[PDB]
Amino acid sequence: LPNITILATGGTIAGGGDSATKSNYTVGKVGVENLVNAVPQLKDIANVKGEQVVNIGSQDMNDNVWLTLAKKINTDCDKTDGFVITHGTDTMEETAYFLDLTVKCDKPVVMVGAMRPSTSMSADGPFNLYNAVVTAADKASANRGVLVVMNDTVLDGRDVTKTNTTDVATFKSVNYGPLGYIHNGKIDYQRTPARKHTSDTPFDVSKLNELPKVGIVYNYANASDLPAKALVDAGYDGIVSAGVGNGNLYKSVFDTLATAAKTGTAVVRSSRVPTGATTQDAEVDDAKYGFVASGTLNPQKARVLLQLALTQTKDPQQIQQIFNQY
Amino acid sequence: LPNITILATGGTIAGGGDSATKSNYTVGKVGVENLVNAVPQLKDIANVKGEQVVNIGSQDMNDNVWLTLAKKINTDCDKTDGFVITHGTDTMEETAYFLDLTVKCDKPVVMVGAMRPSTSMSADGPFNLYNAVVTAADKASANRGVLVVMNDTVLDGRDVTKTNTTDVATFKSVNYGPLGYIHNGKIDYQRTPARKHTSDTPFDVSKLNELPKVGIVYNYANASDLPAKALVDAGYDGIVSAGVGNGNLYKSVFDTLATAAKTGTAVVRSSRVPTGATTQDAEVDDAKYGFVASGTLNPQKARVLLQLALTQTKDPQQIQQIFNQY
Amino acid sequence: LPNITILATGGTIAGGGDSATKSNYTVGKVGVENLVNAVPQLKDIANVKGEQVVNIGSQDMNDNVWLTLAKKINTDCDKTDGFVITHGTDTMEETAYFLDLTVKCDKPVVMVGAMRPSTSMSADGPFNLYNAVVTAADKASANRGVLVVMNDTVLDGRDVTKTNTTDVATFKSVNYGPLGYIHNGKIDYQRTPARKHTSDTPFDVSKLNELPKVGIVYNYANASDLPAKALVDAGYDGIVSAGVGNGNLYKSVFDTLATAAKTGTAVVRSSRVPTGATTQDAEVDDAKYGFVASGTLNPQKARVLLQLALTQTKDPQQIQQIFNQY
Amino acid sequence: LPNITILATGGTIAGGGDSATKSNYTVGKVGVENLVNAVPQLKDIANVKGEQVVNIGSQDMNDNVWLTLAKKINTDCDKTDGFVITHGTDTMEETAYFLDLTVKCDKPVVMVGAMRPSTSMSADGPFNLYNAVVTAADKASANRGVLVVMNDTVLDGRDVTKTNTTDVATFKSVNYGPLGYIHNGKIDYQRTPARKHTSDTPFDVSKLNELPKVGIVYNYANASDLPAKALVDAGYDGIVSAGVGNGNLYKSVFDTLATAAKTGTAVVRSSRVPTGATTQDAEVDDAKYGFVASGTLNPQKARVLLQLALTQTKDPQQIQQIFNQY
Ligand SMILES: N[C@@H](CC(=O)O)C(=O)O
Ligand SMILES: N[C@@H](CC(=O)O)C(=O)O
Ligand SMILES: N[C@@H](CC(=O)O)C(=O)O
Ligand SMILES: N[C@@H](CC(=O)O)C(=O)O
């Protein structure tokens, strides 16, 4: 068998309910150990070693945890065959993409959570954990980047997102589809990311204790400029716009961000629209204004890349090239 | 043939670039009487009369355009057999729901735009416009609320949303599906909305000059409390949270919005997740904090309803009731 | 609490296996009183009585089970407050549509199965059944036709189909979407079917021992006419063509079915394509050949309706109208 | 500018009706000279050579057209820089997979069609054609397999399928998603098919003038054995079974097929279910009865692979192997 480490961070997968009938519950009661001691079948597929890193709802996920997850993984690379990260579902797609850009252990890194509490009828957690370990142990999983494994499906960390608020089938790669499917403890990979990841990225967080400050502002009919102005006033390093349609902006927000972009703030145009690319060559002349278009990166995911871009450069043209590559 | 009034507001639908192949276009350029003439086949299904209300990209849509439109429709109600509104696609989903809650005319009101400019190859707007007049002229279209017609589909104002940044098929009713499909100038209707709309709402905008101020804040890992603080300091009537997962909030945003709610700001919890409801009895004790769960309403649609609700009440209790009925 | 009757027919929901992480299983094996006993939370929402009808895999479902089911619900209607039918997943969409047109009880009638064996890890059966009883118990579920409840979603008998071979989220209403979602054992209904069902149909099976023979043939490139020829020669009362695109047929198949239409056989054009309507007034002149367009009814569903159609009439115009109403 | 050969085979893209608004049309009557001419913007991206092969609707596609096409592409290979094939949409997903297996040429082959006839009001053919030539001319499109280019999307020949009967966005790669998206005449490829293709397959058809005979039977409730029986009694080389759920079979059809398989007729189990794999080690024991499992190949595509498999072999288990690799 291969050697698999489970790094826990909390989530519903660790969370406990009032009873079997209710999804009013608390997030993150239990640790790595008895997520295992509730799925004895793991003994048949892996040598499983579990360690607690934090115990939180992913809605409170932050840069500190990302830094410590990355450094951990980059350090214990060669004491294990692969990693599984138990995590809340809410911000799983952010963590996954951050680790997809910062981990250099080319070994399998898989993330997993649960949409149902552990104490509920037909709790997804167990079989989800089974299948993340499978993906982690299978050696075909390596060099594909950081993974999310949910509902018998293996998804790439860059394209994966939470598409539904309550459904066990929420996680999908909405633009380019999944990498593989899991039936009977086996995977059929028919796809791999072309965007560079893990050890082909230039990002180094090994010495960092904080990350550049990047916020997100939302666009809509009659949008206030007040949220954009508070991020500039507080000297934010970057701002991602969750634009309307193809990264378009309400004029008031446009004006403020146009100003911010010529005054030491990096501006990435993303979209509130859940699928498809925020392109160049449309309604907004990015060159004139010094903005960067995010492509298929949603706001949250754009934020992740922008922070990392900003650990290297503050020039928009080079941030655009970075957005064209990872 | 029935009399159809086209109210034009702008959009790509009235767009046009410097080329048929190139994507670079300007919106709100062509006049309504031109739009009509590029679709003479209109001549055989209605007596079309065009009126220009504004000529803008819908990224710049605002409360005044909404109020103008609703007042125009309610006033001219019984001098026409139905209405079409030509509109950009970026915030069509917001206008549509606005009019769904404020039009009293029980004749059909159909909104329509185009993902590709008029000058473009295989332009979508012509047939979109035709189908939208077919919808508006159909007597079965009446009593279904305000409709959006795009890509041979009839969709309800409440559930319709833009799912894709560039695809002609972007508009979908993502939670409950379309009302009907259009083939050969005819509709087979299999669904009507069950929530109260149009003439059954208490919202009366006929004497109203402004709407209560509602802003939207976004949640993500390490989210700043500054955007939300800026809205509270400006004395906002309501705030809509674009939450993570089932309407959850980053801890520092939670704190600012809790505080706002005790000082008589409406706070609605919605979700950045494109599908599914933000429910009560999840992780957040709505009753304690005086919050409202938005249901299947996404943030930009929650704002629409929250502004109108605020014209009747500021009791979160009654606002929740409205969010459960409209 | 309401008296709910469970009518069991088989399926994986009732079909065990050897180990929890091996996807082998035998189907239709456990009895109704075991299923009920395995879910004690039932006792909090309903007084549940089980009756075994059959115990097969749904792949082996047949006209005789369908007639027993309908006659049973029609006799026992007034002894209970709602029915649930445990049933295999493979042809649940066929049976649901059959009962949708023949049950005369307007009390809730809910079907349910399981995509995973009841012994496997994170088995859907127990929660699936609870939600089905929740729906059968909810009075709001009356007058909506026959329902399929799977994955916290209530779907109408007519539009519902299996979209995926293994996924627990397989059942969707792919043309018009769900009626309602379930959360914390409560249902928000936003939709009901417009097409007529249950007691608003003329089908009366109370004294039928058999149904008209209807068979389905597939179309593809270079398709054999042979299968259509074999059904003709055994004297089939009707044939449904799974066509290509919009109900189109390989020439050889067309001409056989055309001959047969002249010799009193009912011919319905449907489509191998999973979503969308087989329409009239495209490439096939149905009037000329005595053919019927199925609309959004896929081949196996189109079959159900043609069988029941044939218990009233043989005229192609009347069958078309039936196809347009039910 | 690159040299692009267009091989026209017909389709709605070469179809036409009496009126822009009326849906009745006839297929494959517009010549390639007139198609090309209807897109003058072609000159700007290629030097295009129009060659008619046949002018049929793809409902009548057969083996002889497939062979004329393969041969013509391998022969004409070194005289051109890429291939575009105008076709009908109804079987495009069959032809695409056949050509994907038999073209030995490494240059790009791109299939294109239209869902609306060229006379239709917002005809998709002219822009679709342009995009086809873009994909064909982009040098990064090389080495990906045979492509289908519809609705601004570049889809691979193995996974692409028609999901809807009338919608312009009907072509999707429903299990593993698309290869790239086209904006503004350029393509960002993020994926490539893993399974083998074009130059890297065993199959040569340079000299074959006939392909083995392979038919498809459909499973459903109370399904008839007569179609299956008809096909063995004609001594068909192979039978594909569109099964219910995970390739399950009605009892009487199971028998007639068990027979066929271990008396020298090959039998692939596929599924009527539009997505997901017909897997081994579920309900049926494939090795015992001598059945091949089709994986994520649907019936029509499994037939393409099985036809071609039988040029090389007849043992079940080497056909199972071709079904794990191609
Ligand atoms: N709030 C939870 C939700 C979940 O895990 O399902 C989390 O993200 O930690
Ligand atoms: N910016 C445009 C985009 C479109 O119409 O497609 C609008 O006004 O929404
Ligand atoms: N073959 C089974 C599958 C299931 O029940 O899920 C049946 O249809 O009975
Ligand atoms: N029946 C036509 C449909 C189309 O081309 O859109 C064909 O496949 O030839």
| Residues contacting ligand 4 via CB (< 6 Å) | C 245, 248, 283; D 10-12, 27, 57-59, 88-90, 113-115
Q: Which ligand is nearest to the CA of C115?
A: 3
Q: List beta partners, residue C189.
A: C180
Q: Which residues of D85-108 are buried (b: 16+ CB within 10 A; e: fewer)?
A: bbbbbbbbbbbbbbbbbbbbbebb
Subunit contact C194:B193, Cβ cutoff 8 A? no
Per-residue DSSP letter, D157 = T
Is the beta carbon of A255 within 6 A of some atom in ligand 2?
Answer: no
| Alpha-carbon Rg for chain A in angstroms | 20
Please name the residues in contact with B28: beta carbons below 8 A apart, sequence gap of 6 or more. B10, B11, B14, B15, B54, B55, B56, B57, B88
**Exposure of D265 by Cβ count < 10 A (0-12 exposed, 13-18 middle, 19+ buried)?**
buried
Q: What is the largest CA-CA distance in chain C?
A: 60
- Residue in D closest to C270 by C-alpha: D165
**B111 close to A (CB below 8 A):** no
Distance from residue A232's CA to the centre of ligand 4 (Å): 55
Half-sphere exposure in the Cβ direction for C171 (13 Å, CA): 30
Is the beta carbon of C12 within 6 A of some atom in ligand 3?
Answer: yes
**Exposure of A234 by Cβ count < 10 A (0-12 exposed, 13-18 middle, 19+ buried)?**
exposed
CA distances from B14 to A27, B17, B161, B169, B193 (A): 50, 11, 21, 18, 30
C248 near D59, Cβ under 8 Å?
A: yes
CA distances from C113 to A33, C15, C65, C116, C125 (A): 34, 10, 16, 9, 7
Distance from residue D82's CA to the centre of ligand 1 (Å): 50
Interface partners of chain A (CB pairs < 8 Å, 3 or more) are: B, C, D
Distance from residue D60's CA to the centre of ligand 4 (Å): 10
Encoded amino acid at C41, one letter: Q
Cβ contacts of D227 on chain C, cutoff 8 Å = 215, 217, 226-227, 230-231
The span from the CA of B53 to the CA of B66, in Å, is 11
- Which of B190, B192, B281 comes nearest C184 by C-beta? B281
Is the beta carbon of C115 within 6 A of some atom in ligand 3?
Answer: yes
C212 near C259, Cβ under 8 Å?
A: no
Residue D301 CB coordination number (10 Å): 26
Subunit contact B122:D126, Cβ cutoff 8 A? yes
Q: List residues in chain C that are followed by a break over 2.5 Å (C to N).
A: none
H/E stretch holding C261 reads: helix C251-262
- When scoring D39, D121, D122 by the number of chain B Cβ atoms within 10 A, the one with the most, hence best to mutate, is D122
| Alpha-carbon Rg for chain C in angstroms | 20
Distance from residue A50's CA to the centre of ligand 1 (Å): 20
CA distances from D123 to A278, B125, D48, D131, D142 (A): 26, 11, 21, 14, 28
Paired tokens of B158? 């409440």
Choose among B276, B309, B275: nearest CA to B292. Answer: B309
Q: What is the 3-state secondary structure (H, E, C) of chain A?
A: CCEEEEEEEECCCCCEECCCCCCCEECCCCCHHHHHCCCHHHHHCCEEEEEEEEEECHHHCCHHHHHHHHHHHHHCHHHCCEEEEECCCCCHHHHHHHHHHHCCCCCCEEEECCCCCCCCCCCCHHHHHHHHHHHHHCHHHCCCCEEEEECCEEEECCCEEECECCCCCCEEECCCCCCEEEECCEECCCCCCCCCCHHHCCCCCCCCCCCCCEEEEECCCCCCCHHHHHHHHCCCCEEEEEEECCCECCHHHHHHHHHHHCCCCEEEEEECCCECCECCCCCCCHHHHCEEECECCCHHHHHHHHHHHHCCCCCHHHHHHHHCCC
Is the beta carbon of B193 within 6 A of some atom in ligand 2?
Answer: no
* Ligand 4 atom with the shortest distance to the CA of D11: 9
A129 near A96, Cβ under 8 Å?
A: no
C115 near C166, Cβ under 8 Å?
A: yes
SS3 for C150? strand
Q: What is the 3-state secondary structure (H, E, C) of D271-325?
A: ECCCECCECCCCCCCHHHHCCEECECCCHHHHHHHHHHHHHHCCCHHHHHHHCCC
In chain D, which ranges are continuous DSSP H helix?
32-37, 63-76, 92-102, 125-137, 226-233, 251-261, 286-289, 299-312, 316-322
Paired tokens of D5? 């050969």
The span from the CA of A273 to the CA of B167, in Å, is 11
Please name the residues in contact with D230: beta carbons below 8 A apart, sequence gap of 6 or more. C224, C226, C227, C229, C230
Per-residue DSSP letter, C56 = E
- Which of B188, B194, B281 comes nearest C190 by C-beta? B194
H/E stretch holding C302 reads: helix C299-310
The span from the CA of A84 to the CA of A54, in Å, is 14
The strand pair at C47-56 and C82-86 is best described as unpaired
User: Annotated binding residue at B90?
Assistant: yes
Of B5, B12, B135, B153, which residue is the catalytic one? B12
Q: What is the 3-state secondary structure (H, E, C) of chain B?
A: CCEEEEEEEECHHHCCECCCCCCCECCCCCCHHHHHHCCHHHHHCCEEEEEEEEEECHHHCCHHHHHHHHHHHHHHHHHCCEEEEECCCCCHHHHHHHHHCCCCCCCCEEEECCCCCCCCCCCCHHHHHHHHHHHHHCHHHCCCCCEEEECCEEEECCCEEECECCCCCCEEECCCCCCEEEECCEEEECCCCCCCCHHHCCCCCCCCCCCCCEEEEECCCCCCCHHHHHHHHCCCCEEEEEEECCCECCHHHHHHHHHHHHCCCEEEEEECCCECCECCCCCCCHHHHCCEECECCCHHHHHHHHHHHCCCCCCHHHHHHHHHHC
Is the beta carbon of B244 within 6 A of some atom in ligand 1?
Answer: no
**A275 close to B (CB below 8 A):** yes
Paired tokens of A60? 């409170």
SS3 for C36? helix
**Exposure of C139 by Cβ count < 10 A (0-12 exposed, 13-18 middle, 19+ buried)?**
exposed
- Which of B20, B41, B166 comes nearest D152 by C-beta? B166
B291 near B269, Cβ under 8 Å?
A: yes
B308 near B70, Cβ under 8 Å?
A: no
B194 near B181, Cβ under 8 Å?
A: no
Choose among B125, B121, B17: nearest CA to D126. Answer: B121
Cβ contacts of C126 on chain A, cutoff 8 Å = 121-122
Is the beta carbon of A290 within 6 A of some atom in ligand 1?
Answer: no
Q: What is the 3-state secondary structure (H, E, C) of C60-117?
A: HCCHHHHHHHHHHHHHHHHHCCEEEEECCCCCHHHHHHHHHHHCCCCCCEEEECCCCC
Per-residue DSSP letter, D247 = T
Choose among A214, A256, A217: nearest CA to A235. Answer: A214
CA distances from D239 to A129, C42, D61, D203, D236 (A): 39, 46, 19, 20, 7
Of D9, D12, D91, D153, which residue is the catalytic one? D12
The span from the CA of D270 to the CA of D302, in Å, is 7
Rounded to 5°, angle at Cα B254 from B253 and B259: 100
The span from the CA of A307 to the CA of A215, in Å, is 10
SS3 for D262? coil
Encoded amino acid at D292, one letter: V
Cβ contacts of C213 on chain D, cutoff 8 Å = 224
Rounded to 5°, angle at Cα B295 from B291 and B298: 95
CA distances from C137 to A108, B316, C154, C227, D184 (A): 47, 31, 13, 45, 55
Per-residue DSSP letter, C238 = E
Residues in chain C: 326
Cβ contacts of C173 on chain B, cutoff 8 Å = 177
In C187-249, which ranges are continuous DSSP H helix?
226-233
Per-residue DSSP letter, D38 = T
SS3 for D174? coil
Q: List beta partners, residue D160.
A: D173
Subunit contact D122:B122, Cβ cutoff 8 A? yes
The distance of D279 to chain C (nearest Cα, Å) reads 9
Subunit contact A188:D281, Cβ cutoff 8 A? no
Q: State the count of interchain CB pairs (< 8 A) between B and C.
A: 59
Encoded amino acid at C251, one letter: K
The span from the CA of A174 to the CA of A271, in Å, is 14
Residue B156 CB coordination number (10 Å): 25
Interface partners of chain B (CB pairs < 8 Å, 3 or more) are: A, C, D
SS3 for C174? coil
The span from the CA of D15 to the CA of D118, in Å, is 6
Subunit contact A283:B27, Cβ cutoff 8 A? yes
Per-residue DSSP letter, C180 = E
What phi-psi label fits residue C101: left (phi over 0), alpha (psi between -120 and 50 degrees) or beta?
A: alpha
The span from the CA of C241 to the CA of B281, in Å, is 49
Paired tokens of A169? 């089938």
CA distances from C71 to B272, C99, D82, D83 (A): 48, 10, 63, 60
Of C12, C91, C161, C256, which residue is the catalytic one? C12
Choose among D18, D26, D35: nearest CA to D86. Answer: D35
Q: What is the largest CA-CA distance in chain D?
A: 60
Distance from residue B51's CA to the centre of ligand 2 (Å): 19
- Which of A177, A193, A295 comes nearest D176 by C-beta? A177
The span from the CA of B103 to the CA of B85, in Å, is 13
C259 an active-site residue?
no
B214 near B234, Cβ under 8 Å?
A: no
Q: Which domains does chain D have, with CATH numbers?
A: 1-212 (3.40.50.1170), 213-325 (3.40.50.40)
**Exposure of C38 by Cβ count < 10 A (0-12 exposed, 13-18 middle, 19+ buried)?**
middle
Cβ contacts of A249 on chain B, cutoff 8 Å = 59
H/E stretch holding C286 reads: helix C286-289
- Which of B181, B190, B194 comes nearest C193 by C-beta? B190
The distance of C178 to chain B (nearest Cα, Å) reads 6
Active site residues of A: 12
**B236 close to D (CB below 8 A):** no
D233 near D256, Cβ under 8 Å?
A: no
What phi-psi label fits residue B177: left (phi over 0), alpha (psi between -120 and 50 degrees) or beta?
A: left
- Helix axis angle for D63-76 and D92-102, nearest 10°, is 40
Cβ contacts of D195 on chain A, cutoff 8 Å = 190
